[PDB]
């Protein structure tokens, strides 16, 4: 296969076998340690972080009886998320998003999940996610996660991811609010570049979230026999959530469009202003310079000596020329 992961910092393998009586915890790095839990009939959860270690992830993927196509989809990072259906297993890819201040661009990390028989696999490209709340919920016997099957864990991970999307949406909402307020107060270049990057980020967020609602609708309507019917409505709930998310993105995009177009078509008007500022001063002052070069003549004879009060005359001439040249304008708003 091929490797295209951006990060090579760290690798980690974690296992989680839950039951109505006891849960199993095991922190390690050896790939072999997870072989026995695969044979267990109880539902299991596997976490692998770090796509740089291609050998171990390939061995795991081909050890569970998964088609190479799913494996190369896992290795592939630059593609739109979309769910894969099969007669035995299902495979799902998502682009979990995170945002930060001091620099306005979306941060996408690919997260892959596989549900086969009674086993859930999940692969993260980079260290750092928001999948813990369900972890400490199941760890402390909270909720009813233990009683239900692996589909509960699958859509719990999905709903946690869309909750992270909710958080990122509220951060972006703050972004539009502050950008619009600053633009209304003072439209300047920096806010305009912020508008550019916000528009690009909104387009990317749209491109990532639009497939999500279709994916959730597919998992709702298709209902493959692998997933138990008892969890059928719950997925729909997540779908509803995604719908909300999709909606807000659209609105936000509309807003930034309104924050862009009015700034564009008026730029030519700006040029006119510059025109006028470069013209009137060139209209009034340039002849004066010429005048300053004439009555400051340096011939052998000075005709100005014959003239009486010559400088009051020349200063008055320059002043009245300036006045007539400045009242030549502004008659139809050049200032």
């Amino acid at each position: 296969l091929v490797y295209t992961g951006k990060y090579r910092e760290d690798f980690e393998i974690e296992v989680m076998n839950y039951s109505i009586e006891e849960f199993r915890e095991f922190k390690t790095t050896d790939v072999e340690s997870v072989l026995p839990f695969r044979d267990s009939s109880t539902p299991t959860w596997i976490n692998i972080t770090g796509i740089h270690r291609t050998d171990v992830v390939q061995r795991v993927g081909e050890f569970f009886g998964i088609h190479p196509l799913v494996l190369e989809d896992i290795l592939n990072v630059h593609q739109r998320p979309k769910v894969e259906f099969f007669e035995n297993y299902v495979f799902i890819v998502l682009k979990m998003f995170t945002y930060d201040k001091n620099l306005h661009e979306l941060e996408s990390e690919q997260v892959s999940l596989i549900l086969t028989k009674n086993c859930v696999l999940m692969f993260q490209e980079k260290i750092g996610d928001v999948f813990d709340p369900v972890r400490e919920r199941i760890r402390y016997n909270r909720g009813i996660i233990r009683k239900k099957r692996a589909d509960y864990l699958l859509y719990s991970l999905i709903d946690a991811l869309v909750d992270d999307y909710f958080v990122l949406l509220e951060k972006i909402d703050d972004e539009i609010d502050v950008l619009e307020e600053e633009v209304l107060e003072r439209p300047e270049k920096e806010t305009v570049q912020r508008t550019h990057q916000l528009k690009r980020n909104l387009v990317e967020l749209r491109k990532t979230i639009w497939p999500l609602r279709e994916v959730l609708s597919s998992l709702y309507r298709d209902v493959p026999p692998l997933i138990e019917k008892e969890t059928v409505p719950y997925f729909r709930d997540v779908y509803d959530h995604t719908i909300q998310i999709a909606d807000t993105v659209e609105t936000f995009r509309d807003i930034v469009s309104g924050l862009l177009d009015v700034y564009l078509s008026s730029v030519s008007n700006k040029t006119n202003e510059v025109m006028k500022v470069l013209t009137i001063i060139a209209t009034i002052f340039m002849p004066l310079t010429f005048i300053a070069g004439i009555y400051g003549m340096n011939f052998e004879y000075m005709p100005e000596l014959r003239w009486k009060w010559g400088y009051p005359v020349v200063l008055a001439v320059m002043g009245v020329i300036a006045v007539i040249m400045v009242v030549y304008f502004k008659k139809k708003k050049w200032l």
């Epitope: 909710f166 958080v167 949406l169 509220e170 951060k171 909402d173 703050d174 609010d177 909300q244 998310i245 909606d247 807000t248 609105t251």
Partner: antibody, heavy 122, light 107 residues
Framework: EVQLVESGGGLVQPGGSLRLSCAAS????????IHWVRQAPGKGLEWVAS????????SYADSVKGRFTISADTSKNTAYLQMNSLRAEDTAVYYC???????????????????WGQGTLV | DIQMTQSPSSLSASVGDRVTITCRAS??????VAWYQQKPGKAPKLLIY???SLYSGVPSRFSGSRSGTDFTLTISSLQPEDFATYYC?????????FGQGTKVEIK
């Protein structure tokens, strides 16, 4: 016509348990949300409890989570708020509030408390 | 767990003056905040929810605004019945937290 009533207050001996009763008139408890908010004498207000009977979901304040139990029913248009493990810092005024949801964006929905009550000492 | 700070602790002004009370949010809250007044020995009164939408029946001279993550409750002109305590609340989630409470004082 619409107004909100409170009851169940009074002097409390430390270490005891007491139940506050919230009556309603002009409106029903089921349709809207009912909150309980505590204000210390001269200090800031604190939302202590929430209830929404129609949906059935119930949420409690973090600083009180586990101490109190809140519920309501439309049989008598009543809201019950039982409290145990009381202490002297709870010496404040407790208020009933009628709250309705409102829409700001398609993803996050706000909340507001329009009608309150005179409250009782706790 | 989102808290909500308010400034100043208290303010003093006379009738016919514009006063601004600011509300800072340590964590992000989308737009869900509310502004309340509390006359002594009286139930709190809702004034402005969503930081830009006014309740029905409140004086028209009231207003509010939202800048970035921060919030502002401003009054163009005080009233003799308006000197009171003001309160800032956020309702981003089911866990809702109030503000410190600013006291309006006469000069």
């Amino acid at each position: 016509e619409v107004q909100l009533v409170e009851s169940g207050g009074g002097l409390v001996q430390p270490g005891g348990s007491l139940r506050l009763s919230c009556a309603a008139s002009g409106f029903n408890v089921s349709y809207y949300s009912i909150h309980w908010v505590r204000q210390a004498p001269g200090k800031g207000l604190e939302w202590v409890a929430s209830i929404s009977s129609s949906s059935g979901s119930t949420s409690y304040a973090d600083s009180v989570k586990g101490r109190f139990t809140i519920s309501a029913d439309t049989s008598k248009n009543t809201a019950y708020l039982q409290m145990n493990s009381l202490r002297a810092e709870d010496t404040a005024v407790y208020y009933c509030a009628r709250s309705y949801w409102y829409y700001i964006w398609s993803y996050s929905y706000g909340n507001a408390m329009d009608y309150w009550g005179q409250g009782t000492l706790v | 767990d989102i808290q909500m700070t308010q400034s100043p602790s208290s303010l003093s002004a006379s009738v016919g003056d514009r006063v601004t009370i600011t509300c800072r949010a340590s964590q992000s809250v989308s737009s869900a905040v509310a502004w309340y007044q509390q006359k002594p020995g009286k139930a709190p009164k809702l004034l402005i929810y969503s930081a830009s939408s006014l309740y029905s029946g409140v004086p028209s001279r009231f207003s509010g605004s939202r800048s970035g993550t921060d919030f502002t409750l401003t009054i163009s002109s005080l009233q003799p019945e308006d000197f009171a305590t003001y309160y800032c609340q956020q309702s981003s989630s089911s866990l809702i937290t109030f503000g410190q409470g600013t006291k309006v004082e006469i000069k």
